[PDB]
Ligand binder design. Structure first.
Ligand SMILES: CCN(CC)c1ccc2nc3c4ccccc4c(=O)cc-3oc2c1
Ligand SMILES: CCN(CC)c1ccc2nc3c4ccccc4c(=O)cc-3oc2c1
Ligand SMILES: CCN(CC)c1ccc2nc3c4ccccc4c(=O)cc-3oc2c1
Ligand SMILES: [Cl-]
Ligand SMILES: [Cl-]
Ligand SMILES: [Cl-]
Ligand SMILES: [Cl-]
Ligand SMILES: [Cl-]
Ligand SMILES: [Cl-]
Lengths: 173, 173, 173, 173, 173, 173
């Protein structure tokens, strides 16, 4: 089979491939989010930049997973990448809500894979997730929650004003 | 006639002179826009600076056209320059709407001249427009559209507040 | 419809979206190629790096296309991204042959889009492709052809030796 | 009326607008002079540069006038800008003669406006002209007179030689 | 046939080879011009340097054409290079007239090749000429026209004096 | 005749012109060699660079000869330049064999011209060849012989491998 593979279950190997798919889909979703906010009829540069950065971060999560798959002697297998769930993403609030839903799903997939690794007595896998993914994910979700709260505080009765101010004064542009 | 002129039609020569007129008129329109926003009873420095910069950019478009006319062996001919269409330019929104109308007209004149050059098998003319004008124009129109959207989002029911905030937080001052 | 869109046909808009799909698929194909050559049982670092670089270049081609779609006032629409055509890519020769087939297909799609733009009298589109895509593509295809020739010269009767030497002495590692 | 305007007559306000028109026309005349000397069949780079510089200086005179109009609480009003008096400008001598005629007319307009300001007991206006215009104008006219004398000395019986030498050895290129 | 060639007609391939011949002949003509002006009985260093520089520029035009021929998968084919049309080149005026005739012929060959590329729907070829040749050629022809005018102005009745002065005060030495 | 010419025979003058022709032909031969090795179906960059460098060196030999012809008061006369002897140059071995044949012919022409100068008691000519040509030529021929030997050692029974290795490990790329 493999000359390096050791303590690396078929179940973990397949789950890692699934997780790569999920990260690449997330990157794709963020690519779509970023270009939507770049539209001339949306035009929220800070929001564009926030999601563009996340497209790159999620790609690099996939890349790290694939590197690890090879380091362990598993075989990368790629599947079709589903398009994002929407073509238009509504307001900054709508978009940030969709982003936290996405991130919570990615987090649950990380937790599930960690639990599989623990069941399989695969400490390298468990350490890998802990060291490179689980805290990054908690930090990201906390940032999105912070943003959601600030966006919600700004809606009030002048929604356009609040959306502009959030983009200008919170997000980097 | 001319010792350098080669593959440069009378039709293109005249159209280039017309286009110089249009760019100089545009520069004049932007000069008027800039000084209107500098009025003590208007007083939107960022808006002033935005249109002042465009007066200079449109002059330099004219200048480049005239340089090219001479490089090709055509003869610059100047006409009367019509004053701008308004003496007072209303709100930032009104002004940005008038600017995008102006830019779309300049863009259509560029496209028309490109089509004439293509019909006349004048690739130097076509390349010149492509390289120095067509993308600059698309970029400018996209920026104005972005601005229009942000200004429109800010009107809401507190128009003065939105006009101040746009000037302060989007435009450079 | 759109406040900026001008001289930008629905046919071009759709074709640009199709081309984005093709570039993202190409990026995905190169991602798979790169990780295959990173396998412990393949282990050709220079080949890995060559295809990894191309995954990034093709993503950035897609990104530029999407930026232009927005600059013109079109609407990015994303579709499902087909997985790559193979899970395992054979020898360096096999892989470089598959890469040139891919690149020739991307080149033909560029040429087709250029021809559509010309038919539609869309010089901005034509210039955009000429300036950012057509020469990059010719340069890439020429490099791949050079590589193919060198790989073919090295097969002889000691194929493993030739594959090692090409990776070590031509490709960057 | 105006919240800042003080000691600023309607007569001065209108005269300042007229003077802006005259400076912009002068800039236009110099633009035409500059491009005439850039013709391949004229080809006197130093002369081109001399008049090009004056086109920019006269624009900036207009700009300063418009800035002052706003500082005083007057209202900029723009009129049609007459094309220059000639399409072709003859020899360097002809051109320098036309330039000094133009400058003397601008100087007389400055003097007239100064006299109006003095009659109206408008010392800010009087100081403004004295500080930014009257000496600049005297210096420019003296330079042109110097040039005229040197050009006239060079005509003799070898006019082409003299025109070349003046361009090469006096004017900056 | 070729593993890289795509959208590159036999007609364009042959025309590119012809154009290489024309550029190399032009380089040869300029080599002869340069050494004629270096003769002890001609001795016009600035003129020598002007034509020497053009010999190098025309060689590099040929070189770029040959590089492109290979990038496209065509085959460079070289023919005999005709000697220049004269052994002695007369006055600076005669020489500059012969140079502009040469350049106009090269320009017409560029335009002809561009038209062939357009007819063949070869945008890479069209872009290549536009980007590297057509404007360089217009700029060169305009410079030569400028020079011709200055040389003609200097003939007058003291031709030797004018030829010396042009060499000393216009051309770089 | 000439105001500087002294001790410079018609026989030497003509022979120098012949030698210029031979150097320019050699430059042309090397230009063809260089672009052949740049072909996508040849693709030996080090070989390309070796012959390209020689095209430039042989041009500069011609240039020095023409400079000397003028320094002595002779008259440069150019003839038609024959195309190179082949359109395709075979293997690196074939090409290096053709290069040493060419160089030996150029060397014999140098020796013949030296012998003519000696017979004519023209020490300046003799010194010129000795100082700028004869040792450069011996050094070049020795380098080519070294290369030939190394290429021959590498043929063995795996000719493609040897051709690759020579290009990669001996020639500069
Ligand atoms: C599989 C197809 N997909 C998902 C849409 C890819 C493929 C490659 C990508 N490569 C990058 C990338 C590469 C280098 C530097 C920065 C970035 C980046 O910010 C985002 C990326 O996103 C990608 C998505
Ligand atoms: C009103 C139409 N007209 C008169 C023909 C203008 C408008 C704008 C101009 N802007 C410049 C300018 C702007 C920035 C930097 C340098 C220059 C310059 O050297 C000359 C100018 O000349 C102008 C004439
Ligand atoms: C007479 C037509 N032929 C022979 C094919 C020429 C003419 C001019 C050339 N000029 C150069 C040259 C010029 C400047 C810097 C580098 C180079 C060079 O590497 C090779 C050259 O090769 C030439 C051949
Ligand atoms: Cl499938
Ligand atoms: Cl009129
Ligand atoms: Cl779907
Ligand atoms: Cl009117
Ligand atoms: Cl022949
Ligand atoms: Cl002949």
């Amino acid at each position: 089979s493999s000359q390096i593979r050791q303590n690396y279950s078929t179940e973990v190997e397949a789950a890692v491939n699934r997780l790569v798919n999920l990260y690449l889909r997330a990157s794709y979703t963020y690519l779509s989010l970023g270009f939507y906010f770049d539209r001339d009829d949306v035009a929220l540069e800070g929001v564009c930049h926030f999601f563009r950065f996340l497209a790159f971060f999620k790609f690099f999560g996939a890349f790290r997973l694939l590197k690890m798959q090879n380091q362990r002697g598993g075989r990368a297998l790629f599947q079709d990448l589903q398009k994002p769930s929407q073509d238009e993403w509504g307001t900054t609030l709508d978009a940030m809500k969709a982003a936290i839903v996405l991130e919570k799903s990615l987090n649950q997939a990380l937790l599930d894979l960690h639990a599989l690794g623990s069941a399989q007595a695969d400490p390298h896998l468990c350490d890998f997730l802990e060291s490179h993914f689980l805290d990054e994910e908690v930090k990201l979700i906390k940032k999105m929650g912070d943003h959601l709260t600030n966006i919600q505080r700004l809606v009030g009765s002048q929604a356009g004003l609040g959306e502009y101010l959030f983009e200008r004064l919170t997000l980097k542009h």
